[PDB]
Amino acid sequence: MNASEFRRRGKEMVDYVANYMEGIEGRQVYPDVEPGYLRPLIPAAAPQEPDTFEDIINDVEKIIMPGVTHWHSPYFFAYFPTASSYPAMLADMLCGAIGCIGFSWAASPACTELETVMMDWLGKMLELPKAFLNEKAGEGGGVIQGSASEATLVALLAARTKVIHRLQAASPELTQAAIMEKLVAYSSDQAHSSVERAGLIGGVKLKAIPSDGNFAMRASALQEALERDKAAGLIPFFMVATLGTTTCCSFDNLLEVGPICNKEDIWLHVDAAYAGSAFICPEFRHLLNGVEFADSFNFNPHKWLLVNFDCSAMWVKKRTDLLITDYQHWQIPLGRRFRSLKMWFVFRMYGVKGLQAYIRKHVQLSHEFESLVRQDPRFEICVEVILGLVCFRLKGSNKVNEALLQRINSAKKIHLVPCHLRDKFVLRFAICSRTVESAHVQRAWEHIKELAADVLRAERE
Amino acid sequence: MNASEFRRRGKEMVDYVANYMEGIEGRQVYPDVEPGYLRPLIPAAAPQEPDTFEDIINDVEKIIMPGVTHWHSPYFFAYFPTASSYPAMLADMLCGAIGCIGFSWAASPACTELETVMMDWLGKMLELPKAFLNEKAGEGGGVIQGSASEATLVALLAARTKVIHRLQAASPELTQAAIMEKLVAYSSDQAHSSVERAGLIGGVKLKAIPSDGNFAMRASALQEALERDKAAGLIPFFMVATLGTTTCCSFDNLLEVGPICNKEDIWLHVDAAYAGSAFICPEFRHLLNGVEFADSFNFNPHKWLLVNFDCSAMWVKKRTDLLITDYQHWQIPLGRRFRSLKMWFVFRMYGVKGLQAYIRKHVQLSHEFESLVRQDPRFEICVEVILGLVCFRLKGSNKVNEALLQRINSAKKIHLVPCHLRDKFVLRFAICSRTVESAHVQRAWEHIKELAADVLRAERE
């Protein structure tokens, strides 16, 4: 294809994308296909001659869309939001056009320089401690990572390298592997699976800190674990504290665990992948208090700040531990896209106030769902509602709640996922779509309430 | 922004992208900016009120473009090609629209199922051994990785887990760390830096195998290293054999090293990030002979098969070592985009024959540059020209060749990068742009020849 044909087909794709978004409420949010549906519908080999664009777009509607889970339908209330905004789509078109691979500054200066400035923009929007910002010859700085999972791995590997070098300086009689079998990392029992995967990749032990009644990491539980593991010969070196847990959107107490990690020389990484976007709002900034004690901080613009995946924002206090010219030792890959264009377009076309209004609308809708649940004494709220997540369940057995979830997700009118809080099976209601409104939340609750009546009926009859 | 405004701005962006591509030969390929140019030109904080799309696109032209290295200019002859095709751009627009995060099959079935079929399409285009393909209940299969660097790390981690489990089964008295200090991985002395980074992340030793006069790994050098390291107590467990080295596009001898790795129970990973795309052409498929001995194989569609970054294709013979429903234990992150749409659009809109013509044109242009160099006895060809890379230098000192490279890259009419072959400073000429023609290569050589006269003059005067 040459540029003249792209002028035609590109504008046709723009109209197709806009049509899909405008009619997305007519789509069944979760598909009815079963695993392996697609292979019989597609030829077994690539075509030798080109297919037409009309043939391909027809296939998108006829065989791809039936197997799509529509994350951006207003009736998608599963996991956490993923970002979809037209400013980011426009920047992504330019990103593929410039098409640079910014593994070095010389590979494309603007790709690296815009990223450094955008991470300062975002750090200032979150009122991060100045030690995390790159402006004005600070030793800290920020980088875009592909994902919060990758950011947690990068922080673990940096912590691993630092503790090995420290221990080998103290006792030069020590091999790297001899230190390896002693290292232990920590996280909450509510931590995302990315922490376990990072520990497995890094080759170190990982232990969960028991959370309190609010499912938060506290100083008392951390001190109890440290007392045990240090007496056993383990060397704590890395901690993932979570702000906005994937299970119930709980918050580890950084004001308590931060000072302890500093005193113990434990690298403190803060995982705020979802909740971090809300900290641009002054009424939620208190949830980030204690980040001044952290060695690294991370959240995902590509969940809930409208910067299409991939875009994970990671700050560190000392870049040496990982002017910014190179981004090589900051990430796991060497190559990277011009992803800072997406942040630049989104921040500029929405403004800080536009992003704040987006966050506040979602949190308002979350409290609207909470209000409806709190009006039905057959249900209970399991964790305090703070952001765009509500954890709820039918009072009674785990089975009756499992039955409710299966009934909901099988109806495929809305989509939810559950979690386990201790031994308790719990349903999650997450505000996700950019275009969700009060009417959608009210309809979803009516659906949930009707299926609960069926399921409660079936447990006595 | 709502969809109606995206209908306008999206088509405006289509025209901007098409205008940039059509006039790209009027751009200076490498920028004149210096590190840190951008911060003074951009405000220090994000705007509170939205900026206009007109203001942003004006800034793209005025402050972003001056700091862009134009990888898709026909005069970009540096590193290796990176992919830019309009079919991939169209699919990427749809990918951001569907906006699924396919960490599981249920997260969006089509995102996982199309990927499995496209990796079979591509595996069949390369005439890969059937053990690598997923179709027909085979134990092997393919996955898209973010980069060849990530693919090499994934293979190393899989090899690490397998050898630990094997050694602990043989001697249950062994800790993981006790095995760690003995493990050693191997690669050519021409290997990409991704191998060293993978060994550092994985916590294992890495040793380079000396290459022969053609800069290829051979059985004799590998057997000599194994004899030494096994006697020293090291346990070989992982090997990266390279087809199309980053330095000089040389090829490790898989027919020799493959059987050795199998006999030694060394996981054989084949890194063919650049050269792999040419193996869809029957006249180059012989360069892949011996891949039947490999445990994993990887190449980048996002270098030289027109699938815009990111798209790295990795096959394994046993998926257990990492029907396909989940792609979690295949990669380093958990989340992923609908990147298989790009392969589907490119393969269908070009056809196998269109992609073959693309490869063959680039290789023809490479031989055209080689022909010009071979007509000037002041120069020498350092390595056999096989694909889209030519390694050449002025006969004489390393200094005179360093001076030639500085003179070229400072003129900023074309862009080249060098390499070191043993103690020899060598210039690289890589065919990169989708739209490069014979006239561009002929102009570049005339430029190189003129600057060589200046530099040779300056070494005697």
In chain A, what residues touch B55 (CB-CB under 8 Å)? 348
State the burial class of residue B431 (Cβ atoms within 10 Å of its Cβ: 0-12, 13-18, 19+).
Answer: buried
From residue A430, give the alpha-carbon distance in Å to each of A26, A84, A270, A399, B407.
20, 16, 22, 22, 59
**Whole-number Å distance between alpha carbons of A420 and B45:** 41
Q: What letter would DSSP give residue B63? A: I
Question: Do B197 and A334 count as a contact with CB atoms less than 8 A apart?
Answer: yes
The three-state secondary structure class of B41 is helix
H helices of B126-231, in order, are 148-170, 176-180, 193-202, 219-231
Which residue in B221, B180, B219, B187 sits closest to B203, CA to CA?
A: B180
Answer whether residue A163 is part of any domain. yes
Buried b (16+ CB within 10 A) or exposed e, B232-241: eebbbbbbbb
Answer whether residue A47 is part of any domain. no
**Whole-number Å distance between alpha carbons of B340 and B111:** 7
Answer whether residue B95 is part of any domain. no
- CB-nearest to A51 from B45, B341, B349 is B349
Angle between helices B86-98 and B340-373 (to 10 degrees): 150
Question: Do A348 and B50 count as a contact with CB atoms less than 8 A apart?
Answer: yes
**Whole-number Å distance between alpha carbons of B398 and A323:** 32
The three-state secondary structure class of B139 is coil
In chain B, what residues touch A335 (CB-CB under 8 Å)? 147, 149, 309-310
Chain B contacts in chain A segment 89-148 (CB below 8 A): 89-90, 92-94, 96-101, 105-111, 113-114, 116-117, 120-122, 124-125, 135, 146-147
Answer whether residue B423 is part of any domain. no
Q: List the CATH number of the domain containing A132.
A: 3.40.640.10
Contact in structure between A178 and A229 (CB atoms under 8 Å) = no
From residue B421, give the alpha-carbon distance in Å to each of A71, B237, B242, B382, B428.
51, 27, 16, 9, 11
| Total residue count of chain B as it appears in this document | 461
DSSP-assigned beta bridge partners for residue A239: A186, A268
Interface with chain B: mutation pick from A1, A21, A309, highest number of B CBs within 10 Å: A1
For residue A195, the distance in angstroms to the closest alpha carbon of chain B comes to 11
Does B211 touch chain A if contact means CB atoms closer than 8 Å? no
Question: Do A100 and B201 count as a contact with CB atoms less than 8 A apart?
Answer: no
**Whole-number Å distance between alpha carbons of B306 and A154:** 30
Bond before A310 cis per omega within 30 degrees: yes
What number of other Cβ atoms are within 10 A of residue A446's Cβ?
11
**Whole-number Å distance between alpha carbons of B192 and B181:** 24
Question: Do B97 and A89 count as a contact with CB atoms less than 8 A apart?
Answer: yes
Answer whether residue A271 is part of any domain. yes
Answer whether residue A45 is part of any domain. no
Buried b (16+ CB within 10 A) or exposed e, B169-205: eeeeeeebbbbbbbbbbbbbbbbbebbebbbebbbbb
CA angle centred on A141, ends A138 and A147, rounded to 5°: 170
Does B71 touch chain A if contact means CB atoms closer than 8 Å? yes
- CB-nearest to A7 from B7, B18, B197 is B18
What's the number of domains chain A is made of?
Answer: 1
Distance of CA B176 to the CA centre of its chain: 33
- Gaps after residue numbers in chain B (C–N over 2.5 angstroms): 322
Does A309 touch chain B if contact means CB atoms closer than 8 Å? yes
DSSP per position, A278-295: GGGSTTTGGGGTTGGG-S
**Whole-number Å distance between alpha carbons of A151 and A144:** 9
DSSP-assigned beta bridge partners for residue A206: A185
Which residue in A150, A66, A79 sits closest to A331, CA to CA?
A: A150
Name every residue whose Cβ is closer than 8 Å to that of residue A32 and which is 6 or more positions away in sequence: A66, A412
Q: Which tokens in the block code for residue B332? A: 């380093």
B297: left (phi over 0), alpha (psi -120 to 50) or beta: beta
H helices of A171-294, in order, are 176-180, 193-202, 219-231, 254-263
**Whole-number Å distance between alpha carbons of B312 and A146:** 15
Question: Do B348 and A88 count as a contact with CB atoms less than 8 A apart?
Answer: no
Find where tokens 């990072």 sit. Answer: A198
What number of other Cβ atoms are within 10 A of residue B107's Cβ?
20
Question: Do A147 and B35 count as a contact with CB atoms less than 8 A apart?
Answer: no
Contact in structure between B250 and B211 (CB atoms under 8 Å) = yes
Q: Give the phi and the psi of residue B419 in degrees, each rounded to 5.
A: -155, 165
Experimental technique for the deposited model = X-ray
**Whole-number Å distance between alpha carbons of B74 and B296:** 34
| Total residue count of chain A as it appears in this document | 461
Q: What letter would DSSP give residue B314? A: E
Domain that holds residue A274: 100-337
